[PDB]
Amino acid sequence: LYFQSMYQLFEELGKFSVVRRCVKVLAGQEYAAKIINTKKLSARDHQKLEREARICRLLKHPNIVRLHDSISEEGHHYLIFDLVTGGELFEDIVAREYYSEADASHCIQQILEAVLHCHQMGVVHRDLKPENLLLASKLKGAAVKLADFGLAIEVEGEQQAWFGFAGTPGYLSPEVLRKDPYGKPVDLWACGVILYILLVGYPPFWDEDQHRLYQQIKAGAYDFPSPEWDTVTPEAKDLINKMLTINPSKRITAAEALKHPWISHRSTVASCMHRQETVDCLKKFNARRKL
Ligand SMILES: O=C1Nc2ccccc2/C1=C1/Nc2ccccc2/C1=N\OCC[C@@H](O)CO
């Protein structure tokens, strides 16, 4: 009755939920509505929606999409955010004529600033993956924006706890797979996975057998094969090694990654060589995520 009174829904943008473009009619302004069907939810999932709404109002950062309204109706809940109009970063990269380590580094720098902000606010995302990395607009030099904090949790300082088995198979951290207490480091692991894909166009851990995948993640069994990693700077590999560290107490933090020479000295450390095989391989990677 009441949401349909104020917003008009148009096309679908993505999918847990669906996200549709809406217009707030009488204000003549557009947003993205994350629309959750609340029948397909337990008592605990309803309570987690109130936490999701809470978390999203806390976060004010240029690299995080902002929440504008939270409306619950008969069967549904509506979270109304800023509309960002450039689509996935990963889909944008493949349409570019030039793509280098310097571009990867600037993307990761923006992501890490988003993640530092979350961590400073006591918020751990838990599910960072390509799907959450949107572009503010179609304009050149648009900001990378984090969208969707559906699995995000609130942490108490630097305390670790067993918050549940949650996340996406290829980006899951060893500590979560071992069923160990976890916290902020889970997000840095996921960033290492994202940085690896950004450099070569394929993921560090992959197996058609999920149980084997999990054993690979838990062992830290990734490598940098020739020929394609031969033209990657040692400092990009070094950053990846420090994010994909199996022991979360030893893993690099967001604050530390932002001071890493490949990030903070991008302009004199990151390669500017076009990586055409990354572009081509990422197109294939994207196609598999959509299939
Ligand atoms: O503008 C947007 N504000 C948001 C707030 C939360 C979640 C998604 C979006 C979003 C999106 N805007 C656009 C524009 C073009 C293509 C996709 C797309 C979006 N989201 O896509 C779905 C991804 C997300 O649901 C995965 O967790």
Residue numbers in the entry: -5 to 0, 13 to 21, 24 to 299
Sentences copied from the publication:
Calcium/Calmodulin (Ca2+/CaM)-dependent serine/threonine kinases (CaMKs) constitute a family of 81 proteins in the human proteome that play a central role in cellular signaling by transmitting Ca2+ signals. Kinases in this protein family are activated through binding of Ca2+/CaM to regulatory regions that either flank the catalytic domain or are located in regulatory molecules. CaMKII proteins form large oligomeric structures. The N-terminal kinase domain is tethered via an autoinhibitory helix and a calmodulin binding site to a C-terminal oligomerization domain that organizes the enzyme into ring-shaped oligomers.
To address this, we determined the structures of all human CaMKII isozymes in their autoinhibited state. Importantly, whereas the crystallized constructs of the α and β isozymes contained the catalytic domain and the inhibitory region but only a part of the Ca2+/CaM binding motif, the constructs of both CaMKIIγ and CaMKIIδ additionally contained the entire regulatory region as well as a part of the unstructured linker to the association domain. However, the autoinhibitory helices in all isozymes were structured only up to residue 302. Different crystal forms were observed, containing one (CaMKIIγ), two (CaMKIIα and CaMKIIδ), or four molecules (CaMKIIβ) in the asymmetric unit. The activation segments were all well-ordered and helix αC was correctly positioned for catalysis as indicated by formation of the conserved salt bridge between E60 located in αC and lysine K41, which is a hallmark of the active kinase conformation. Similar to the C. elegans orthologue, the substrate binding site is blocked by the regulatory domain in all human CaMKIIs. However, dimeric association as in CeCaMKII, i.e., mediated by the regulatory domain, was not observed for any of the autoinhibited human isozymes. However, no indication of a conserved dimer interface was evident within the crystals with packing contact regions typically involving small and diverse surface areas. All four CaMKII isozymes were crystallized with ATP-competitive inhibitors that are relatively non-selective. The alpha and gamma isozymes were crystallized in fusion with the His6-TEV tag.
